[PDB]
Amino acid sequence: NATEIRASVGKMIDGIGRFYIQMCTELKLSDYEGRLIQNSLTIERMVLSAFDTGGPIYRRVDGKWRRELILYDKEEIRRIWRQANNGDDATAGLTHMMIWHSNLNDATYQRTRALVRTGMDPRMCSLMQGSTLPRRSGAAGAAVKGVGTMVMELIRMIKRGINRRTRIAYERMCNILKGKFQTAAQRTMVDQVRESRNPGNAEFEDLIFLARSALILRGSVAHKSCLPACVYGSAVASGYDFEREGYSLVGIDPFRLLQNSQVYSLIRPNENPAHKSQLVWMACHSAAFEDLRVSSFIRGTKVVPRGKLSTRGVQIASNENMETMESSTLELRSRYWAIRTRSGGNTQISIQPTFSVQRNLPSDMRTEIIRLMESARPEDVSFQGRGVFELSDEKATSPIVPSFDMSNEGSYFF
Amino acid sequence: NATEIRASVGKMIDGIGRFYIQMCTELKLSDYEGRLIQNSLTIERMVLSAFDTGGPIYRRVDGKWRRELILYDKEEIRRIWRQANNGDDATAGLTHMMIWHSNLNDATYQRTRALVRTGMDPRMCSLMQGSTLPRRSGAAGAAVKGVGTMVMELIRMIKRGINRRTRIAYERMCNILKGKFQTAAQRTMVDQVRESRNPGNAEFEDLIFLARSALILRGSVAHKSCLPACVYGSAVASGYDFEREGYSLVGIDPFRLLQNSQVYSLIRPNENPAHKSQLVWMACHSAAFEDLRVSSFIRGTKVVPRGKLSTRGVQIASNENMETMESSTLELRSRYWAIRTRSGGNTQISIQPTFSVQRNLPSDMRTEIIRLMESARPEDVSFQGRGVFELSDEKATSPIVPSFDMSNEGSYFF
Question: A GO molecular function for this record (chains A, B)?
């Protein structure tokens, strides 16, 4: 059913576009200045703030870039927004930029300080997908969350409490949690956790376990390709009428759109452009915890690890100066594309009867997992048969299987 | 026909309720003190005694529990009783508590001393359902009796005799007996027993056989969910008007009622509360000889075997002291519910004609059973298609089939 799903999400994309265009028309920015991922960001946040203000706005004068610090009627923003979405709220829309920000943050930064202070191992990076993503995020907003993400929450919710209506949250937060797991025990053990009203260190210690189980027996976590407002604004302005032509966040749509995007970015004096583009590209698909090998494969070019990456962050801090500042054109094109998945892969003498049921008449769930954990090899092939698609292959017709026998450059972005 | 059966039994339940309330109002007990299964018991027995006295009554003072030994006008009790039942006798009602006691005794105790002294094998536990149940019990009182229960009687009735009106008893006692069996031979062999006026060891030895046949080819024995007086008293007091809203002893009614009951119990210093609740719960449904697997399944939690059970009995003996005595809240809720059943499951050269009948004109019944006994496997599935119901599923609409592939904990409560 390509009617609702493909076209309803198109309508949410149109809104962001239209809005971005309106909002650019207010700031009286130029074309080059509306394609500046910097300005786009500022705008996106102005809005999410107002629906839950001012910001940094960079301008282009003969030669050099001028940063303007501006403020807008928090309500005016809310007004312009609905105007674009037909006076609707389109929470989806705000939630969308709510993720684009997430996916950018899960790639620009490593959130160790928080994991440890929670009592999670810093090496549990690949499980913190969407830790930055405000709780306000929607229902299809949490589906993008990593197993580890959920744990950091419950553990804090629990840690301060164990140190009214708050209950329905906890159970659900676990049901979601449990719905990440895709194996018997995994599933069952989550329940054994959800049993306690005042779950103390008993739970505190157990979920942490399950957190680590996902490092081997991963769960189902959706990935959403969420591009910057400017990209959708520009597209809408170019005529693309997505609600009519359909759009996806896990298909070929997002890659194709980025195959023509003209996004520019501010770049510090010593930073490497090629390195900058990489970053943004990984935020456009939630590839911050993907196997670098595959990311580079699909990308078309080296996908260098975070450490070797030359850049501190895409947003420009108030500290810096504009004199020594310039801007480059972001390389967001990719070689192939792939169905962003959700799956984590996997490899007396008689009895007197008292009830009417189908009945033959006559340990530690940890262990179960630990035993499963064991038989698992890192070489264990997942998504058997699934492949990569050419950018011409609009339909999911012909798949391509990658062979990694190659002089690679690592697998752990972090 | 949900009119008489469902509402007439409601009326008998109202009586017990109303009465319990009146009787609590006399003793001037508190709410917490009326919910004490202990006191409830005492009251129930005060009444059955008077209709065929005093008792132990526990009181709550700052901190500790005080046991009062009290006495009441045997007739006063009989007076208050009828007052509650509209001046009726409601034998059903007395018989009801007559069973609640039974079902509690068939689970708190193992009656081996008596079986052997009768000449029954001690391993015939699962057949002694209702051995404690006074003969005064009604007609729908004996239907709850196990096959083995009947045998212990006849054998004693016979044993002392073989060692006037007493005859009509014996034949009937067998007819009932026979009506337990649900197979040809079983049925027929009972008759071969009922033939002798002075049935000696001939019978003595044969019924014992049939007793053992039921271990394999079980009979039909009804199970009645009979809750303590307090539970009905409390319910009546809460507004539930059962005669109008209907009630059952083999439907969802009893489980639902126990889903809100606030029953408390006296508990000795070293005893395990969780273990205490289990006991009572098994007496509330005549699950003392049920397959532990299923009991736990429906229960929602482990249903531990009698040996591993930490408790000596719910009633407090005159021996004990109150100083070292405290009380817990009984866990009587269950996960699902099931239709308490009655069924035991199963898998010259010519002739000169002298009479006018449809006629083509031309060993040891033990063997028959022993042969049937044989083909029987413990794995033989019973109640094919019958399942368990959610506690929301008021109607018997959607059934649930349990799969016991699982790390269970036994099948024989004893």
Answer: structural molecule activity
**What is the dihedral angle through the alpha carbons of A73, A78, A82, A87, rounded to the nearest 10 degrees?**
-100
State how beta strands A264-267 and B264-267 pair: unpaired
Cα separation of B396 and B252, whole Å?
9
Count CB neighbours of B38 within 10 A.
Answer: 24
Nearest to B383 among A351, A359, A363 (CB): A359
Interface test with B, best of A195, A355, A360 (most B CBs within 10 A): A355
- In angstroms, what separates the C-alpha of B27 from chain A's closest C-alpha? 37
Domain residue limits, chain B = 2-414
* Burial tier of A397 (Cβ tally within 10 Å: 0-12, 13-18, 19+): exposed
Pairing of strands B65-71, B54-60: antiparallel
Checking A116-121 for CB contacts under 8 A at 24+ apart, the result is A118/A152, A118/A155, A118/A156, A118/A159, A119/A155, A119/A159, A119/A204, A119/A208, A120/A148, A120/A151, A120/A152, A120/A155, A120/A208, A120/A211, A121/A212
From the list A352, A358, A360, the residue facing B378 with the nearest CB is A360
Measured in angstroms, the resolution is 18.0
Q: What angle do CA B21, B24, B27 make, to 5 degrees?
A: 160
Q: Do the beta carbons of residue B400 and residue B336 sit within 8 Å?
A: yes
Nearest-by-CA chain A residue for B387: A357
Phi, psi of B148 (to 5 degrees): -55, -25
Q: Nearest C-alpha of chain A: how many angstroms from B386?
A: 4
Q: Which residue has the tokens 């007496």?
A: B283
- Spell out a b/e string for B230-259, using b for 16 or more CB atoms within 10 Å of the CB, else e: bbbbbbbeeebebbeebbbbbbbbbbebbe
How far out from the chain centre does Cα A174 lie? Answer: 20
Tokens of A227: 């591009």
Residue matched to tokens 């054109």: A329
Cα(B362)–Cα(B358) distance, rounded to whole angstroms?
13
B340 Cβ neighbours under 8 A, 6+ residues apart: A354, A355, A356, B222, B223, B224, B225, B249, B250, B285, B286
Instruction: For residues B358 and B376, give the distance between their C-alpha atoms in angstroms, rounded to a whole number.
Output: 37
Distance between terminal CA atoms of chain B?
39
3-state SS string over chain B?
CCCHHHHHHHHHHHHHHHHHHHHHHHHCCCHHHHCEHHHHHHHHHHHHHHCCCEEEEEEECCCCEEEEEEECCHHHHHHHHHHHCCCCCCHHHHHHHHHHHHHHHHHHCCCHHHHHHHCCCHHHHHHCCCCCCCCCCCHHHHCCCCHHHHHHHHHHHHHHHHCCCHHHHHHHHHHHHHHHCCCHHHHHHHHHHHCCCCCCHHHHHHHHHHHHHCCCCCCCCCCCCCCCHHHHHHHHHCCCCHHHHCCCCCCHHHHHHCCCCCCEEEECCCCCHHHHHHHHHHHHHCCCCCEHHHHHHHHCCCCCCCCCCCCCCCCCCCCCCCCCCEEEECCCCCCCECCECCCCCCCCCCCCCCCCCCCCCCCCHHHHHHHHHHHCCCCCEECCCCCEECCCCCCCCCCECCCCCCCCCCCECC
Q: The tokens of B401 are what?
A: 């089939």
User: In B, which residues are within 8 Å of A188 by CB distance?
Assistant: none
Locate A295 and state its tokens: 């990311």
Q: Which residues of A touch B (CB under 8 A)?
A: 348-363
**Contact (Cβ atoms closer than 8 angstroms) between residue A313 and residue B251:** no
Pick left, alpha or beta for residue A239 (phi over 0 → left; psi -120 to 50 → alpha; otherwise beta). Answer: left
DSSP A249: S
From which experimental method does this structure derive? cryo-EM
Q: Are A353 and B291 within 8 A, CB to CB?
A: yes
| B349 Cβ contact partners less than 8 Å away, ≥ 6 residues apart | none
